[PDB]
């Protein structure tokens, strides 16, 4: 029975699970875009979202410095987190990372995904786009909306 379990079972144990996610998170900070199996990306996405929150607390915070010191294996990325990533999302309150599915790798046909921080300097991904408002279906609903607004003002 697994009811309410929000954390997945990966690696060689609970401790190995943190280390595997720590390597993915550290590689995500340095490159701002990585590709990995879908399950590991989705599990790491939660840590990446909350890592920016510790970066907004400032580098003078002892508690925030320890989390950056732990979750960033490479020590050169810690100045980047408090001086690039945290200022970048100062206005935003959440949803700093976007996760998209990519074709499965040929090695083992594993479900893959790409996770990146918003606002990066890398070329934009071919993001999925909804149908344009100039399509036939959208125009019929657009016309209905106009009359409803006109009727309400009456």
């Amino acid at each position: 029975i697994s009811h309410g379990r929000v954390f997945r079972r990966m690696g060689l144990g609970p401790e190995s699970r943190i280390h595997l996610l720590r390597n993915l998170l550290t590689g995500l900070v340095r490159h701002e875009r990585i590709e990995a199996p879908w399950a590991r990306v989705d599990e790491m996405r939660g840590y990446a979202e909350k890592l920016i929150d510790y970066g907004k607390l400032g580098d003078t915070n002892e508690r925030a410095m320890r989390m950056a010191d732990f979750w960033l294996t490479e020590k050169d990325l810690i100045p980047k987190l408090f001086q690039v990533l945290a200022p970048r999302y100062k206005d935003q309150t959440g949803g700093y990372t976007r996760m998209l599915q990519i074709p499965n790798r040929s090695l083992d046909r594993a479900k893959m995904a790409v996770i990146e921080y918003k606002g990066n300097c890398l070329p934009p991904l071919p993001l999925p786009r909804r149908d344009s408002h100039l399509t036939l279906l959208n125009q019929l609903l657009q016309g209905l909306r106009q009359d409803l607004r006109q009727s309400q003002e009456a």
């Binding site: 340095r30 050169d76 100045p79 980047k80 690039v84 300097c121 890398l122 070329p123």
Partner: peptide, 25 residues
């Protein structure tokens, strides 16, 4: 993206030299 990341490596010239400023391509 691979071409861009190869240019970044030639500028840092070694590991543990991540810049503290934004990047522009």
């Amino acid at each position: 993206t691979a071409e861009i990341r190869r240019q970044i490596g030639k500028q840092e010239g070694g590991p543990f030299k991540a810049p503290t400023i934004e990047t522009v391509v």
